[PDB]
Design a protein around this ligand. Structure first.
Ligand SMILES: *[C@@H]1O[C@H](CO)[C@@H](O[C@@H]2O[C@H](CO)[C@@H](O[C@@H]3O[C@H](CO[C@H]4O[C@H](CO)[C@@H](O)[C@H](O)[C@@H]4O)[C@@H](O)[C@H](O)[C@@H]3O)[C@H](O)[C@H]2NC(C)=O)[C@H](O)[C@H]1NC(C)=O
Ligand SMILES: *[C@@H]1O[C@H](CO)[C@@H](O[C@@H]2O[C@H](CO)[C@@H](O[C@@H]3O[C@H](CO)[C@@H](O)[C@H](O)[C@@H]3O)[C@H](O)[C@H]2NC(C)=O)[C@H](O)[C@H]1NC(C)=O
Ligand SMILES: *[C@@H]1O[C@H](CO)[C@@H](O[C@@H]2O[C@H](CO)[C@@H](O)[C@H](O)[C@H]2NC(C)=O)[C@H](O)[C@H]1NC(C)=O
Lengths: 443, 105, 119, 132, 443, 119, 119, 443
């Protein structure tokens, strides 16, 4: 006969949702590295065999917790320092000296309250045009975000460098890491390894182009929940990085004034040399070859179709322009110099110049109730990064035709981190199991 | 503007005789009014603090009353001195105008 | 071998390394870690308390008096202990498993009462 | 008692100018309003100017608006009044007065407004007259 | 001889106090129902047989926890809302232009700070006379509670809907439900049942009258910790609810002004048509019969004297008038129209009019540390409720063998919540037990 | 029959439904929920530690070598298991339950030491 | 004797009071107290799980099928149980404590598997 | 052969670090001790025998944790109080009219706000010269620390009484208490006792000296981690206390002005009587004998040499003078009148007066900014305390001389609590233990 028996510590899991916690190396960073628990010096990654796991990065909940944690950390990093509410004053601006772009910077003057509440001081500062809008459409001017939220100056001590962090799970749970060669967004992973914590993920905030992201192994892969649907973001991961460097030619000089008891305020005092706009360079041959490979990979999915690209759809800068974080300055600028070409089945010191603008007041998290005032960086600022991914978006072409139009755009920030957490899935351990055995309990 | 009117302009008196001085207001001033006394060749001095209050340093014999628009300075004239020109000035007003001036002897 | 290293191995072979799986069960980041730790303790106790009342507390392998029925699974023990895996085993009996626990609890309580009456 | 004297008066020509000075002592001069009044023969007393503790927001009567100027020196504990474009009917005994209640308390825009004052101390006025 | 033995899972309990957690059905509510755990479809209420234990509704820590939780949620809801501290400005109020009750409303005009810090605007508004006090009786008016606390405007998006909430106990604790009929109050219960979570408790707030409460089973239940004592509040539960309805005929208009850099301020605009004070309607027949029944029930415990009833003694408007929460307005209606009838040992379109006055600056929890500025609700608001209980207090100290006096009006909102928690008691379950049995342990 | 359903029933009948009773033992609202959960875990561990420290771990019904003292109770055994209820019985044991626990602790320690010394 | 009142006592004499220590294992101030409470619970389970996976659940004194290695300690049994305290022994066994635990769990699991196959 | 056996509940311990908690006796105190768990009238204290434990107070983590706990308590206590940021205005200060420290006090007048933001007010108040600094550098002045951080007025309802707090450890850990006679900071302890909670630790706040602290039992105790190093603080404990009495002859009159909505600001109205300097008294015979005993005991560590005391090292007023907390008022007494004498190997009241100064603006933790404005205490205030410890600091040059100079400094806030927590240490008990024996389990 057969009898019911139980087994403890059985090796079986089940998909579930749990709260994850950070893991960073050992106060001066916006991601709160010191406040987070120290990183495990040796994460034991146990390899598995004879097992296949069904992965789906378009439905995992860990990415949502990552987004919430990033937002909470950003808010926690902005509130403990200087606020900038008395800045909403009628600014009187005029044209700059125009030392060889004319509308790219304005010379403004306004009243401000010094440390003495009964004393008023007058200051002169330079603000970008994108940071100021007319107050009555005629002279006088007002900041861009003054009728929607309170301006809060960023903490000068902290840094916005995307330091990598590790995501761990509490006891009783595990994170399955897919290691299949060329694994797409969804499918059965035949090479799965169990790890307690995820690898070092850098919380980048770039849009329409992934910077310092993960790299492919052998070929360019495409991730999409529904490739047929044109309303889903088409994430593309490159195999070879494309070097990109940006530089602003303004030798900006910082000046500081104090308002109220403390609350040190920083602004742009003067510009040494000829004023100029920011720009970014990318290799011509490298980007052209990478774009050709991406077009070929897209053609493989569609089938004998000539892939063409456009210069996005059009709208607000934050949505239709590339965003940067490196150097403490948020570069919001054009991308038409890259997604402007055509392809077909048949097919040095040369770079592409992409003009760029500078913006200080930003609402990066698309929140109308919060804002941040980025202080100017003294002197000349340089930056360089590696392009590893792109955020394409197929247009709503109804007719089949011969060519398909693809436009860069993410429409949200959630898909940015989905390209890095594609190889992770949190599960819960079930050490209790039941199996029949010939043994029987005795008195 | 506002202007005061004081009457009688002049009247004869003596030691112990009972007299009275009053002034009227064209506009409502509630109780913001003070009286002053001024001897010939001497600077004026305050006499009445408020409509129903007495100025410090002034003897208790002097008194006054009135409210709204009619005010009367009660003077029993028992004392032999202070037989000078009395003024009725209305404070709480843009011109802080004074009275015409009434002299008693 | 390692933690959870025999997940895909044979059920019979995976039963030889159950102790490695059972032993490894145990300002925003501060509260987050606190909640994660209490959740982990809760998860461990959820199974420890359930296994304790079955009369098999502290035993990795235990035999019960509840008899097996072919209705739940007609599979033979040969293929189950020779090439079948624990993952697929749990994937086959996902439901109607909670009743087994009730039968084990009732049988264990009745056995305890009978043992008390015998002694 | 509070000592208050004034001087600087004298003969003048119609349409010219003249400056008056008032001295104060025995009290905190930087905490009380100052006023100037005149006494014409026959007609009663007429108020012509006022000044706060700080010095600004000067007040003047319609009969001397734009012609006279009042100022004070807190450090010197003195009060002055400037006469410009004076005419024949401006002759009177100008008296320097001081309010009773100080400027401490609630206020709207100047520490001395919103409060109703009255003249308490009157100095020995000086005579100012003009002729042909 | 006998030896000691131990048992587990024993059915015994002890009276103790523990922290409770809320659970609701499937933010927009002021009670923060989104934070509560989802309640089960139905709790396994186990009816107990042959179980009798002492009950004391007047001595239970559950009501204290409920009161503290309600205050905590209220303060939590007002913390992220817009602050209205610059509104303390002098007001120049005049009579309303509309004809026809004009003394209860004033048309005031005052300066206000616009979005820009260096700019001010002029606004006209209508404010009630209750929340307006004179400055010097010159006219210049000032809002009430301006010299005692900083007023805070309530968030227009959130609502004060009295959605029911269920109070639950953690693992190891159970709630004893005394579902016995005729349960007057403290004493010994019977037909007790055990439930994990309590039923839907209405968090509605009211004074000297219970609305939307639990009805009695068959006979009117009167509760008092000491009915003979004159310093104790007496609660009465009716069997047949009395329908009540109040309306606000004033067709108020809502306008918005940018009070600060992003935040908005809502005030009351011009009223369309004639103005009329708010009032409530109660059926004379139902109220008369209910009053006779409660008079008989009250006369049963006391002597065969004459019950008289009377209006409120006086004092503050809150302790005298009755409150409401009809949508977004907090009414304060008179009470001389109900408790104005005597009863001996034996005893218009059937509607009683009840005058009411609207008030914006209010103190919901008799706390002077802060204040509420209820925004005006556009249009005409109507509400309907059921009268389920009445709070009565007896005055005097003489014998008065001819008649007895009773007056309505409670002391705190804590007593209000005792009507719903009269049949629940929290106990601690201990599964350990010792009993002797002829058992010999083996070697 | 139900959780805590045999509380007021007979003494003997209440000793069979112990298995079901042992199973059910395990911003502002979030912190209160965490506090209640931690308190529940502590409450369960408080009794589990005492049960396992007496040598009767994983046993619903257990007996030790400590002899019953007549000073604690003088009523007959038949009325205890036939005409008695746990509610009115726990009341008198509250005065000497700690002493009984201490005696069980000492007896368990000495018994286990003697058992180990036997080998 | 009290809690932890036999630390300096003889090895053999300290084994008698093993129940006095095991029984005692269980705005800013509120969160600190909660953190300390959860830390204490985690500390208790840290050793409870180890004592339970070795088949010695609910037993103060347990025996394992693991032979003693002379490399760990060359001292005689008499010298250990009759000439030193527990504090002067943990500092010598702390080097190979983890290895001893691994051997105990592996031996216990193998013994349980063999016992199940035998029955 | 021999076999291994596991022992549970074994009596061993290891050094570790945990989070302690308050256990004061049965909230409005500045430390909020009423919110913490209640105390135990019968603490769990068990004596030990034949046990030696290595103690080191300079390396324990209890003082570092207590410092952070006190800082957090202070910060959370001053958080709900009124903010004094609008008071940073220009003050026109004059003399005190010399009513007869006729120069220390200053009569200042300034502009201030009120309940209505439209209206303003002018008020006069008396302030100390130490809290006033010139702004024009020569009539008008400005407050100190106002140019660095905001000012926060302490709530007058709270009390700064140093009530004792008991530090307990959670379950699974114990505190080792040393009772050895003449036990210094380091060294092994022979008389060790185990206790669950610490004794009556009073969190007194003082510098350059210790008040209301613990005392020795038989002889003077000298503690230092490195006596040969002059940079280390030399904490000495007295065997008998030295009484000290202080008085503030200035009969203060507290007034109040309502600034902003609801909140108010307290200041000094007028001084009744003549202006007098606050001072302290101490017996010359007692202090002289104490100094002789301290010099005799300290002479052992430096051979048969002479001991000389100096009057601090100079510099800031907060690090070279005393700091009291008598009744909420902070006194800065001149310590030069005590540490002024010399001693050799060979060898009536007449009380020694110490002139003291008072500061309303203070930063006890010496942190950059975040100063607290202490409200003035009405009426005369007296104070009495016992001197139990001295914070000496070794000073020397070539060190080959026959004399040594000791200056009372240290300036470390952690040294205050370190003089009381020298008898405790936290340990982690490990109930799991293994030992060989001769036995084998059954199969
Ligand atoms: C409260 O607020 C009041 C209203 O704002 C303040 O009054 C202001 O006081 C300041 C400081 O004195 C004045 O501003 C500066 O004053 C002097 C000029 O003063 C010199 O000349 C005048 C006569 O012309 C004389 O009285 C003085 O002694 C000096 O010789 C210069 O430093 C600057 O140019 C500047 O004007 C303001 O004028 C005055 N405001 C008004 C409306 O009068 C007051 O000081 C504040 N504080 C207190 C404690 O009341
Ligand atoms: C508190 O008393 C203890 C002893 O109960 C003192 O510890 C002793 O510290 C001295 C140095 O101050 C040590 O002497 C040194 O030891 C070694 C070996 O000789 C070497 O480094 C030096 O040559 C020197 O002699 C001494 O060994 C040490 N004793 C013990 C038992 O640890 C401690 O200094 C006293 N503290 C105070 C402030 O008095
Ligand atoms: C993916 O998105 C498409 C829309 O682009 C979904 O709808 C189908 O679209 C195809 C396009 O060839 C049509 O032939 C089908 O009739 C559409 N289905 C329906 C129900 O309208 C499609 O369902 C999505 N999913 C998949 C798996 O393709």
């Amino acid at each position: 006969n057969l009898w019911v028996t139980v087994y403890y510590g059985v090796p079986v899991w089940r998909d579930a949702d749990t709260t994850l916690f950070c893991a960073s190396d050992a106060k001066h960073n916006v991601w709160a590295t010191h406040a987070c628990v120290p990183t495990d010096p040796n994460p034991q990654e146990i390899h598995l065999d004879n097992v296949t796991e069904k992965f789906n990065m378009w439905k995992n909940n860990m990415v949502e917790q990552m987004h919430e944690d990033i937002i909470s950390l950003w808010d926690q990093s902005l509130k403990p320092c200087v606020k900038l509410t008395p800045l909403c004053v009628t600014l009187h601006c005029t044209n700059v000296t125009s030392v060889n772009d004319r509308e790219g910077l304005k010379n403004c003057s306004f009243n401000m309250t010094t440390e003495l509440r009964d004393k008023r001081q007058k200051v002169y500062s330079l603000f970008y045009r994108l940071d100021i809008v007319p107050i009555n459409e005629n002279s006088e001017y007002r900041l861009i975000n003054c009728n929607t939220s309170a301006i809060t100056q960023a903490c000068p001590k902290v840094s916005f460098e995307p330091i990598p962090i590790h995501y761990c799970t509490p006891a009783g749970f595990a994170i399955l890491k897919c290691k299949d060669e060329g694994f797409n967004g969804t499918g059965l992973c035949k090479n799965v390894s169990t790890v307690q914590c995820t690898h070092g993920i850098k919380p980048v905030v770039s849009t329409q182009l992934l910077l310092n992201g993960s790299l492919a192994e052998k070929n360019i892969i495409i991730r999409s929940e529904n490739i047929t649907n044109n309303a889903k973001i088409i994430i593309v991961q490159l195999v070879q990085p494309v070097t990109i460097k940006c530089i602003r030619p303004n030798n900006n000089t910082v000046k500081s004034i104090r308002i109220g008891p403390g609350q040190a305020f920083y602004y742009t005092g003067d510009i040494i040399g000829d004023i100029r706009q920011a720009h970014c360079n990318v290799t011509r041959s490298r980007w052209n070859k990478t774009l050709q490979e991406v077009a070929e990979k897209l053609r493989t999915y569609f089938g004998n179709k000539t892939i063409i690209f456009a210069n996005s759809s059009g709208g607000d800068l934050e949505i239709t322009t590339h965003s940067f974080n490196c150097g403490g300055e948020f570069f919001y600028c054009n991308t038409s110099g890259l997604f402007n070409s055509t392809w077909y089945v048949n097919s040095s010191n040369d770079t592409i110049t992409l003009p760029c603008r500078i913006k200080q007041i930003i609402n990066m998290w698309q929140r109308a109730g919060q804002a941040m005032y980025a202080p100017p960086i003294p002197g000349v600022i340089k930056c360089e990064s590696n392009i590893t991914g792109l955020l394409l978006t197929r247009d709503g072409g109804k007719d089949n035709n011969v060519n398909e139009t693809f436009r860069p755009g993410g429409s949200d920030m959630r898909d940015n981190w989905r390209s890095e957490l594609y190889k992770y899935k949190v599960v819960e351990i079930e050490p209790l199991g039941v199996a029949p055995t010939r043994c029987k309990r005795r008195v | 503007d506002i202007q005061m009117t004081q009457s009688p302009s002049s009247l004869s008196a003596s030691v112990g005789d009972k007299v009275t001085i009053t002034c009227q207001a064209s506009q409502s001033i509630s109780s913001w009014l003070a009286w002053y006394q001024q001897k010939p060749g001497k600077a004026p001095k305050p006499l009445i603090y408020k409509a129903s209050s007495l100025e410090s340093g002034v003897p208790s014999r002097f008194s006054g009353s009135g409210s709204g628009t009619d005010f009367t300075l009660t003077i029993s004239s028992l004392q032999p001195e202070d037989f000078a020109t009395y003024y009725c000035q209305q404070y709480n007003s843009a011109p802080f105008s004074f009275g015409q001036g009434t002299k008693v002897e | 071998l390692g933690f959870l290293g025999a997940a895909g191995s044979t059920m019979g072979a995976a039963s030889i390394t159950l102790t490695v799986q059972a032993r490894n069960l145990l300002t925003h980041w501060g509260i987050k870690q606190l909640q994660a730790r209490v959740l982990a303790v809760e998860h461990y106790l959820r199974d420890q308390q359930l296994l304790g009342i079955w009369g098999c507390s502290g035993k990795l392998i235990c035999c019960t008096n509840v008899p097996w029925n072919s209705s739940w699974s007609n599979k033979s023990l040969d293929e189950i202990w020779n090439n079948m895996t624990w993952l697929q085993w749990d994937k086959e009996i996902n439901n109607y498993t909670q009743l087994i626990y009730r039968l084990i609890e009732e049988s264990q309580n009745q056995q305890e009462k009978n043992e008390k009456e015998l002694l | 008692e509070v000592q208050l004297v004034e001087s600087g008066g004298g003969l003048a020509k119609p349409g010219g100018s003249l400056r008056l000075s008032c001295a104060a002592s025995g009290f905190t001069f930087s905490s009380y309003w100052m006023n100037w009044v005149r006494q014409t023969p026959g007609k009663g007393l007429e108020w012509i100017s006022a000044i706060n503790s700080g010095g600004g927001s000067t007040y003047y009567a319609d009969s001397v608006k734009g012609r006279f100027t009042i100022s004070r020196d807190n450090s010197k504990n003195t009060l002055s009044l400037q006469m410009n474009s004076l005419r024949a009917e401006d002759t009177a005994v100008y008296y320097c007065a001081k309010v009773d209640e100080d400027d401490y308390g609630y206020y709207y825009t100047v520490p001395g407004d919103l409060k109703k004052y009255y003249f308490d101390y009157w100095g020995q006025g000086v005579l100012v007259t003009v002729s042909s």
